[PDB]
Ligand binder design. Sequence first.
Ligand SMILES: O=C(O)Cc1ccc(O)c(O)c1
Ligand SMILES: O=C(O)Cc1ccc(O)c(O)c1
Ligand SMILES: [Ca+2]
Ligand SMILES: [Cl-]
Ligand SMILES: [Cl-]
Ligand SMILES: [Fe+2]
Ligand SMILES: [Fe+2]
Ligand SMILES: [Fe+2]
Ligand SMILES: [Fe+2]
Lengths: 357, 357, 359, 358
Amino acid sequence: EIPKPVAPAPDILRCAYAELVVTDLAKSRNFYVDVLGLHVSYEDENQIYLRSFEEFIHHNLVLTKGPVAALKAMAFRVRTPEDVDKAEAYYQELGCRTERRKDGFVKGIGDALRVEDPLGFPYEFFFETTHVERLHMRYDLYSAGELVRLDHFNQVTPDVPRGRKYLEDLGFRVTEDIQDDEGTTYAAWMHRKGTVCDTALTGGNGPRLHHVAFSTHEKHNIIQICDKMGALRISDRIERGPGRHGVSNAFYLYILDPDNHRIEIYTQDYYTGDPDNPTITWNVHDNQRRDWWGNPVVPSWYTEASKVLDLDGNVQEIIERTDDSELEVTIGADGFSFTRAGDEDGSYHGQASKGFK
Amino acid sequence: EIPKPVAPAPDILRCAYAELVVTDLAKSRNFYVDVLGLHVSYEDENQIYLRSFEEFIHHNLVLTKGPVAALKAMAFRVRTPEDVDKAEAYYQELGCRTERRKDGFVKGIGDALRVEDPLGFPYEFFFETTHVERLHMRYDLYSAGELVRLDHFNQVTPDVPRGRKYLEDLGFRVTEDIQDDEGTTYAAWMHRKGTVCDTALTGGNGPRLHHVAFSTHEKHNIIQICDKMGALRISDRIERGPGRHGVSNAFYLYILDPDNHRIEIYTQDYYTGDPDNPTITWNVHDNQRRDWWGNPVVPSWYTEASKVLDLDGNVQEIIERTDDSELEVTIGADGFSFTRAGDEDGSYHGQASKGFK
Amino acid sequence: EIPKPVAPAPDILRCAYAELVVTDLAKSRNFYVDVLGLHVSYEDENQIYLRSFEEFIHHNLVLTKGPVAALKAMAFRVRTPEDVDKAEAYYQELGCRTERRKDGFVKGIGDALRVEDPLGFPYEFFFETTHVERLHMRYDLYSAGELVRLDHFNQVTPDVPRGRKYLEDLGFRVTEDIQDDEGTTYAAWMHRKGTVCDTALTGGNGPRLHHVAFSTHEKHNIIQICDKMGALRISDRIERGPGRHGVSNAFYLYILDPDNHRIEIYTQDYYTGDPDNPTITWNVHDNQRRDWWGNPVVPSWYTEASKVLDLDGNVQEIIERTDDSELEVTIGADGFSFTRAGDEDGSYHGQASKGFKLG
Amino acid sequence: IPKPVAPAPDILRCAYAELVVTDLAKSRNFYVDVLGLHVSYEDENQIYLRSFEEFIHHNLVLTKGPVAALKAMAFRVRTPEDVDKAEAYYQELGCRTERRKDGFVKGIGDALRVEDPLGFPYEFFFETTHVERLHMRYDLYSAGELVRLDHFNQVTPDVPRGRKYLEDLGFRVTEDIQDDEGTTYAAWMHRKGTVCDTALTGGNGPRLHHVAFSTHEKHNIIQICDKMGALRISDRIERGPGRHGVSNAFYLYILDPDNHRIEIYTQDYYTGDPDNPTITWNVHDNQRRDWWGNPVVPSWYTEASKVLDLDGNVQEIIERTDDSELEVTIGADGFSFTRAGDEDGSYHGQASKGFKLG
Ligand SMILES: O=C(O)Cc1ccc(O)c(O)c1
Ligand SMILES: O=C(O)Cc1ccc(O)c(O)c1
Ligand SMILES: [Ca+2]
Ligand SMILES: [Cl-]
Ligand SMILES: [Cl-]
Ligand SMILES: [Fe+2]
Ligand SMILES: [Fe+2]
Ligand SMILES: [Fe+2]
Ligand SMILES: [Fe+2]
């Protein structure tokens, strides 16, 4: 297990941006700008910097051209400039590789620390960022599918309890999780900013980035994204949804960018800011835990996720999960799920719900 | 081929109500009233008469207790009392069995003609009906899932072209249809009231009733029905959806009542009332034709449908479709669908879209 | 009273388009295209042809440059080419001036009849029109405020019963109206296509055009139009709303184009297509009849409306209403309105609701 | 008001209000039958109500009494120890305090009430009885469902004096309304990372302007209006619905049976970063309150609820001497603009959209 440092944890505000390596910058621009409507904060021949409708920091997404599509950094904003120093001491005590750039790794971020964290993920911590025009009332720019905030990340990692404890020490609080009666944990959601999560852990082979999630105002905004993808005849890039989540209670959609990076669109989870916020544990065999309406979870959702890079820009080696697989125990040949616990009517054995194998 | 009568067709206004035979009147009441929120016009120990939020005629749905769950009548309102005379002469010329009752078959309907039509379906034609309180501004009653109108019926019949010609002679105009490149028709939608349909034909073994559809005002009302069914832990009665249709462009959901009668919830199709309204023909292998977002159509949607009765109340014998099956050609072991015509990428061979078999 | 002709009425399908004369074509284009998002079917230096998201006929709105802003024609589509002949015979029997153009008055319309109707309004009847790409599934184009259909017209005329009878003979059925207990009709709504209206009559000096109405899919689309107008710092062009109507039960908004032509945005009225559809009569003093939430009706809504042209292109002379004024009897100095019939509590005497008086 | 040496309590959020109501049954009809709030406890004396997503015992306590008024506006603090900190903080300010180890109302434990420097009855507590969180109970969900308590708004005569005091208590200003000659008319300030938890409106005070509840979506607010029309109580819709300038939220103001003002609110923005950009509006900007330029009804500026001291007696009102927002915008000498510097779309001596004061 990952020891708790004696050094104080940095005070993390929220998830702030991701840097994604993409192979074809123009095709990625098409997707994030022309399809999804994100707002350009800066661009050149090598990178595109993008933000959501309500953001005032420089960006929520950096697309960087490179040879291998991968997550390069998932960045958290910290409360004060001194929290970057705290982050550096903390990860140094953990024995992690760190790199400090006083003028930042990407445009519009100042003093920043990147680390290869104990789960193999490239985290950035920063305070300083260039403020830009907050577009929250620019209804002359507002899209029918407008993405309004960056909401969270979701990470694939083999040992969820191990990661959970490490994130708890860093000040994240678990809001919801998925377990079975045998005591296996399959997934956990944890927050700093007072929503259901800022990052989440999904059990599986890792380190891999499962998705980045953006918010909309209303459910019809998410519908419109689907409708637009149909009109553009790219409905094959709709992976899963739209649906209502069990965990989080949010309305959701998962789509795939040109490099198969998964993006979640999300709205209307609940407030978690009180320190005794009640934690919700779902049973892995509950067929309403993921999609509340009982729609089946496509296998690619469980098996596919993005590579992540180390600080040299090389792909991180993957460690295979040895705990039980959520896919296998729910929709695989020996799996099952229920609608009502203890009722064989509305239960599914060795296949998924709604009549699919 | 069904001949065109010399006798003038009745002027049909719209689909008006269905009479469904149900086996447990209390369990059906719980579904239609407590779950779905339909409004009771009249009830006793044998029947429940239900209407939608904006209706002023007596009812849109009659639940009749009986031994075998089935459609007993699908009723269309005609423009004048004299149109019921026209209907009787028309169907008599077609050689169809008819029955006229000057004081109605069900409460709140006056002079009414029931027929066993050329496709084996029990049609009713009526003008006279008891007006009731139109609840369209009763927002003190309005449900988060409120059903606002009856929109259409959908019939399973083995020979779609044969049925289409008959309905056209009767004054219905085809709005959309599904065909392939080998001369087969799989489905057609046709209207009187200036929406995408009043009734529709689905290719399959029949006569059977595929579904009855009710409208909501907005898409979030359909999402609420799903959310409520999750909370009631009856998500296993959500068959398909929610989604955006290709055909009709409506937002939709299909659910199953306690006798497996299929109900569609529907909103926001388009105006068809101009006589040169452009017809839209989809290819049966186009994976956006049914669900615009490419979500797979569950096999039960193709295979399951309700019995229909003759005028003596006996189940109509089912005649097998010999034309190609939409299920088989799209999602069966030798099926095919595409996202983009001519593009191998995003096509599906011998399985359904989005990872499922 | 206007006689019922012996000649059969044309079979009218629906309101189809309006031709509005505008003074500055580029400013008008900015409003209808850049602000409101209507789709351009054709344009040149003299005219802009616009359609809604779900339309397949050539256009729903023609903007024509000219010296005096006005309604030039309100056009109804008829069921068959033969109905254009029927319309011509019908209006000739009424003694009205008519003009027939075999190849249309505006682009994308074929054989068309324009008439100076008995209320002084320029009506067009046509069947033939150039079909265009129906954009109803073009969600790549869909705006957060998208206008999806043309819904109706609303006309200001001094004598509502006179107009009502004439339109009923033409086959429109009244769906709702506003009357008082002393025999006065203040407004009526009437349809062909099975919505609350295709045209409507509002009591006042006329002929003038009160508004043209377009639909949206959902209420949030109307909210977005307001939000966008705020962002563009043209909220002064929001005249009234948004609200819920009593009459029609639709969610609504009224805005003003650059020549002060009034546009209604509208959604979620109810089905009226049955021939015995119940007619709803509201009392003029009911403060929920126009805005269901009781918000006050701005005086300009009652006083301001667009000029209309005759067939020569000259403005029609205005005839003064002599019947009682809706403005005066509800929000004027001797006006009255109620929230609950017979309850003094929530009534308004000599002023508007919600703490306001006439400016 | 000086900054104490004693540390401020760590305040999480607004948590509940206790309103005194004169007829408990009529108030129940409004809050439960009209608005759909959920009952956590009730008897002949009190009704305890919560929103759809709440897990603490209540967001609103309706207490029967002779004079309708705010009795307490309560904030939840982060730890039990923060209640001790609140007590020492307000004692150093010289304010009257009362501590009850077992609470003032049911479902709250150790609690401190104070008559604060602006005359308002604040409560601070940590301990509360958890209840069933109804957030997925879509079998109960109303077309107008109130999902959270969002904020309070207080009327006080000197906004800068109040603002400085709340800043010392850890609230951060998000937005405000000023004029060019240095008068402040209103300020909004937060702890939980929304546009506010409490807010100050310039006017005679102390009075409680409103309590605000959230919905999920804008159509839920529309439904509340529609329902009030159907119930033929549209006269209790005071103002709206609208889009706010300040906050950018969709809104509605309605009046309960004792004229307590309730706001329904949705879709403001995230303010939790410590350098969150502040926004200051000019008082003459006709889009600052209603973004669409709809007129602000005069009662919104003039009417607000009494507040009580710790003995249950009404607090004396102190008159505002700074300029009045009503007078400078919609009064006979008032003005507002749509575009700064433009006479077109400006209003002089009356409100927008063709109305003057009734
Ligand atoms: O539907 C699921 O898989 C559960 C779930 C809940 C919240 C999320 O953000 C997420 O990505 C996944
Ligand atoms: O419209 C207004 O008056 C400005 C405003 C903004 C946010 C609030 O919560 C509020 O109560 C008032
Ligand atoms: Ca009278
Ligand atoms: Cl379908
Ligand atoms: Cl009106
Ligand atoms: Fe997620
Ligand atoms: Fe259907
Ligand atoms: Fe209108
Ligand atoms: Fe407020």
